[PDB]
Amino acid sequence: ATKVAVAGASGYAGGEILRLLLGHPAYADGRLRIGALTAATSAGSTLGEHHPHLTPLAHRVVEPTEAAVLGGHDAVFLALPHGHSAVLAQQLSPETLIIDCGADFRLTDAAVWERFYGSSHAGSWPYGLPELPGARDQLRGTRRIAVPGCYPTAALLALFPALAADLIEPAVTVVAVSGTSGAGRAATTDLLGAEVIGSARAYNIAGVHRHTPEIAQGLRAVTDRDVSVSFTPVLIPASRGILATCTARTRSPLSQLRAAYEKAYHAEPFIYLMPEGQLPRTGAVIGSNAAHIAVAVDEDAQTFVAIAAIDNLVKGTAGAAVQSMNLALGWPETDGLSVVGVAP
Amino acid sequence: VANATKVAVAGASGYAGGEILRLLLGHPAYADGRLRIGALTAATSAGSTLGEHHPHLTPLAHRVVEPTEAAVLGGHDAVFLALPHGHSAVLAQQLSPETLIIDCGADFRLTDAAVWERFYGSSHAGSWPYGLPELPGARDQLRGTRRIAVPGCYPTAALLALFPALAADLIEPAVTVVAVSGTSGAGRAATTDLLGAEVIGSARAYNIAGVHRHTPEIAQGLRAVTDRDVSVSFTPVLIPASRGILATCTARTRSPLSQLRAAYEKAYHAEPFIYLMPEGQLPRTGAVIGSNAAHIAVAVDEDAQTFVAIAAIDNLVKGTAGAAVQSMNLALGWPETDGLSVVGVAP
Numbered sequence: 001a002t003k004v005a006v007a008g009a010s011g012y013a014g015g016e017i018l019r020l021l022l023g024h025p026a027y028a029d030g031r032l033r034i035g036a037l038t039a040a041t042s043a044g045s046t047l048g049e050h051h052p053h054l055t056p057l058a059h060r061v062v063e064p065t066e067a068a069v070l071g072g073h074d075a076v077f078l079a080l081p082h083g084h085s086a087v088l089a090q091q092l093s094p095e096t097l098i099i100d101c102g103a104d105f106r107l108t109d110a111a112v113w114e115r116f117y118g119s120s121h122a123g124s125w126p127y128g129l130p131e132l133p134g135a136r137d138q139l140r141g142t143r144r145i146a147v148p149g150c151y152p153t154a155a156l157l158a159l160f161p162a163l164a165a166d167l168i169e170p171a172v173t174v175v176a177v178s179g180t181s182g183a184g185r186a187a188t189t190d191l192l193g194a195e196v197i198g199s200a201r202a203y204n205i206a207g208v209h210r211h212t213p214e215i216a217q218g219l220r221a222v223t224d225r226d227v228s229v230s231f232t233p234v235l236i237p238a239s240r241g242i243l244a245t246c247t248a249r250t251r252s253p254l255s256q257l258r259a260a261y262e263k264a265y266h267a268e269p270f271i272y273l274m275p276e277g278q279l280p281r282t283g284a285v286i287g288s289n290a291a292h293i294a295v296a297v298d299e300d301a302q303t304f305v306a307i308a309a310i311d312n313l314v315k316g317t318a319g320a321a322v323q324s325m326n327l328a329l330g331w332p333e334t335d336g337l338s339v340v341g342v343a344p
Numbered sequence: 345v346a347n348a349t350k351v352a353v354a355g356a357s358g359y360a361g362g363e364i365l366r367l368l369l370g371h372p373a374y375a376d377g378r379l380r381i382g383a384l385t386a387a388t389s390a391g392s393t394l395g396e397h398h399p400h401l402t403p404l405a406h407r408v409v410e411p412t413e414a415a416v417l418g419g420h421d422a423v424f425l426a427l428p429h430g431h432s433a434v435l436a437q438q439l440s441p442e443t444l445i446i447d448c449g450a451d452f453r454l455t456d457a458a459v460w461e462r463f464y465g466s467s468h469a470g471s472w473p474y475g476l477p478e479l480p481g482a483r484d485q486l487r488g489t490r491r492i493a494v495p496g497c498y499p500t501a502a503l504l505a506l507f508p509a510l511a512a513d514l515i516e517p518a519v520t521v522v523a524v525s526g527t528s529g530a531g532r533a534a535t536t537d538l539l540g541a542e543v544i545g546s547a548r549a550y551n552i553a554g555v556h557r558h559t560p561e562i563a564q565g566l567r568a569v570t571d572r573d574v575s576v577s578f579t580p581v582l583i584p585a586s587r588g589i590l591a592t593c594t595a596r597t598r599s600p601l602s603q604l605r606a607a608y609e610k611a612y613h614a615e616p617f618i619y620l621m622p623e624g625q626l627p628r629t630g631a632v633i634g635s636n637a638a639h640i641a642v643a644v645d646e647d648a649q650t651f652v653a654i655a656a657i658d659n660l661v662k663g664t665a666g667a668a669v670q671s672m673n674l675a676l677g678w679p680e681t682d683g684l685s686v687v688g689v690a691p
Contacts, residue, residue: 200583296552
């Protein structure tokens, strides 16, 4: 009987965790129960007031986030993706499965962590991207998961098989368009619908976005070369989805790059390589745990192009958390996680 | 100079054609009767009224759209052509040589015939003055011209983001451009791909890896400001907005930011339609929508040794019909900014 707490239940990531927990087969047959739901403000409200889609849970009372209230469960999701849960996490049984959606345990280099986050490095846990080389073995039976950023997920899946095969140069460029749920649920003026609808803007450009060092890290794990990453995020008028356009210099033929992708992904249940002459679109993956990837070579520009679409809130966040949870617990990896998008 | 213009618009039922008409209606020469809007043509739906295609242009809603034929178009001092490629090549032969022809199509844009044939599969028609007044030397070609090749919308954004850095030799001549575009940039021909239900809530790269026809136009405009060999990786991305291009443009650099900034200030400090963002501010297409302005920011990613330039335009105004009307003013000797706001209609 696995009992699950969700900390930060009232944000978009915690609500998506909850959606996926409700359709999971272990919730259906009673192997999984949903326990405490916690947030920082508005303890006492019901979940219905934060998440009106989650009607089976609408009556649950949101409790304050405290170590003791998260205590007494077998898995704890901490869905502060812009939060800092290192504190909570040090006060829980090393036998409690902790799946942190935040960044606290993502980065392996303390100098990098301090620089980008301006605090003390908490350490690093198994990175919840099972498709990266060697990641899936770290995750089997683990009691600790650092879920990847949404953008690192899309860019890593677009780029790592080319770079691992040494078929492109290790200086990469990523420009990724994203829906606004990826910015979180904070009432800012720059996130108001009247401001975002009809409009597009890059933000946190030229190296300041904290996902830059995350992408570098993931690629440095598949190569001995010095990796450099130009990362530009662009907010677009959609609620969900990331479309990552990833490029690097190459002198390799298209047919060799294509084989490196078939090889890496042929048995990956969540990776779909586009058929010949098709390109990814984020509307096809919305609400699914899938990544749709197409690769190409720009001969005149000597440039390799990889395009990856994901739902930022599923494969980029809560579907990755749940996928890695399946692994940590010995359950089928694809349990509760569809590859079919809700389109149009 | 010009004390009067009778103007025809061919391809009047398309997006660019309807935006030319909007700008002409609000143009001061239209208000004081120096500009008369004459024949409105479209090969398609000839016989309908303009109101059936463009309900926003109520002052012209009763005008009957005529067939696009040189005889309907003759008798005008200025003719806008917003037509598929190849059409203006034919039309330019048939109209008086003394007519001002402002071509929104691609026919006269490219200066290399081999590059044209490669991307279009037809005979090169020639090349006319490129209607981007802000590029070095362009304003001198457009003053008093009778021929204008209006730029494509994406090269407009990518050219304005990148030329100053490259002209000053502060970036490498190998550039990457990822530009997100509203769907009006894909035209007004009804296909499944461009349906509301498919576009809304979705983003997709298309015509990637160098196959997009705007790619050689970016390379051409960049090659005109440097003696180096230029390469362009251009990726266009359709997004769920109807208007706006946000171009993210990068090239390797070893130049300090202060030197890059200075080159942009030098380029744009007295350009009425270019707003170089104050340091720490970034462009948004919502701020330029409905105006003839480009908002630009630049920065350096030191760890990646990469120059980053962001440009925002309205694809239908500075990227198309605004560019056309701005170049028309130059061609006619009227104030360059007539009819053209720098003020976006936001939110």
